[PDB]
């Protein structure tokens, strides 16, 4: 599904 | 009043294979979820009985975002290695934490979105939940990415809407485990260290949640600098243990009193060594 984003 | 937390650890192993991703979820001091990328079946797994009842969509959903975060942090680990101009032979750690604090009225006390690289703060969501704090110049790359995506607004909606709803669900399903407050069982132990000196150790056992305050006073004045504390430790049955000790002159023991503060107590307790 979806969860945090780290760039 | 209550808290829901997600913890993740990404550790690279140079030459030994791809980075390991370990994630766990807590309601307060109770861990009900885990994910390990090293397992033969890397799925989100229940660590507590009351979350085992969740249907198939819940486990596809939880395993869904665990695997996605594992992928996200693996790409982040290689990107951070480049941006910091670091050798590929060394191992590095990427940690992250998110979740909500809910008050007794059911509203949001505080949100959290934050990461740490090699045990040092990297980037964190501020209290207004509209802005970020980047620790160094490298982290400003992540901040600018967050701002371009308007990611603070997206996660603020999760913190306000769903995070509270998930916490209410768990507190209801885990009502017996989660909504308890077990008061400490407290006593004072006396251990002579010499002919002229002895140790007074104040014990607190069987208390939940883990937050507690044990202090020593001499004739009413607290001995802050002279008190030895140990890290609060789990008993393994769902309760916690802690002690505080002070070195006192032999024969002066009665001048000292221990004070125990825990949310499971109707009020704070006072103890003396009873000879």
């Amino acid at each position: 599904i979806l969860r945090w984003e780290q760039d | 009043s209550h808290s829901l937390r997600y913890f993740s650890t990404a550790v690279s192993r140079p030459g030994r294979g791809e980075p390991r991703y370990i994630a766990v979820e807590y309601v307060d001091d109770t861990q009900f979820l885990r994910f390990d990328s090293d397992a033969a079946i890397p799925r989100m797994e229940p660590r507590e009985p009351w979350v085992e009842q969740e249907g198939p969509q819940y486990w596809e959903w939880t395993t869904g975002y665990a695997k996605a975060n594992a992928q996200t942090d693996r790409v982040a680990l290689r990107n951070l290695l480049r941006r910091y101009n670091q050798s590929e032979a060394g191992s590095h750690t990427l940690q992250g934490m998110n979740g909500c604090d809910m008050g007794p009225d059911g509203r949001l006390l505080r949100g959290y979105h934050q990461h740490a690289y090699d045990g040092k703060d990297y980037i964190s969501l501020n209290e207004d939940l509209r802005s970020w704090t980047a620790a160094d110049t490298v982290a400003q790359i992540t901040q600018r990415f967050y701002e371009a995506e308007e990611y603070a607004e997206e996660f603020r909606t999760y913190l306000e809407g769903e995070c509270l709803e998930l916490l209410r669900r768990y507190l209801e399903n885990g009502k017996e485990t989660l909504q308890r407050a077990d008061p400490p069982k407290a006593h004072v132990a006396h251990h002579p260290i010499s002919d002229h000196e002895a140790t007074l150790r104040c014990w607190a056992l069987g208390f939940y949640p883990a937050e507690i305050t044990l202090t020593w006073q001499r004739d009413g004045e607290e001995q802050t600098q002279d008190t030895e504390l140990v890290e609060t430790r789990p008993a393994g049955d769902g309760t916690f243990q802690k002690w505080a000790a002070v070195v006192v002159p032999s024969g002066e023991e009665q001048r000292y009193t221990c004070h125990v503060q825990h949310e499971g107590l109707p009020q704070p307790l006072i103890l003396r060594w009873e000879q």
Binding site: - | T9, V11, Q31, G119, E231
Partner: protein, 100 residues
């Protein structure tokens, strides 16, 4: 990378009584990085069946772990926890102290 030395506590879940079944705990906390080796020793030998908690960490990002095994304490049997970590030049053994 920063390095934090593990703090080690060896204790029983319940007050120890000879002949009564109990749990032996080794709590390792406050360490960075996460790689660590924790063994429970009985009379100097590794205990084969030992379980540990899932990796988590505190507000300051330092890790903590609980290693535990079911046991029945006796008078003659000595127990200890052996911990090895990158911050330790040699593995550290902490004897279980029954008066506590």
């Amino acid at each position: 990378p920063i390095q934090r030395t593990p703090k080690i506590q060896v204790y029983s879940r319940h007050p120890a009584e000879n002949g009564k079944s109990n749990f032996l705990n080794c709590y390792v906390s406050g360490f960075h990085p996460s790689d660590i080796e924790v063994d429970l020793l009985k009379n100097g030998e590794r205990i084969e069946k030992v379980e540990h908690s899932d990796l988590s960490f505190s507000k300051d990002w330092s890790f903590y772990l609980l290693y535990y095994t079911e046991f029945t304490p006796t008078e003659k049997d000595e127990y200890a926890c052996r911990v090895n970590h990158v911050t330790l030049s040699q593995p550290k053994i902490v004897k279980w102290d029954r008066d506590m």
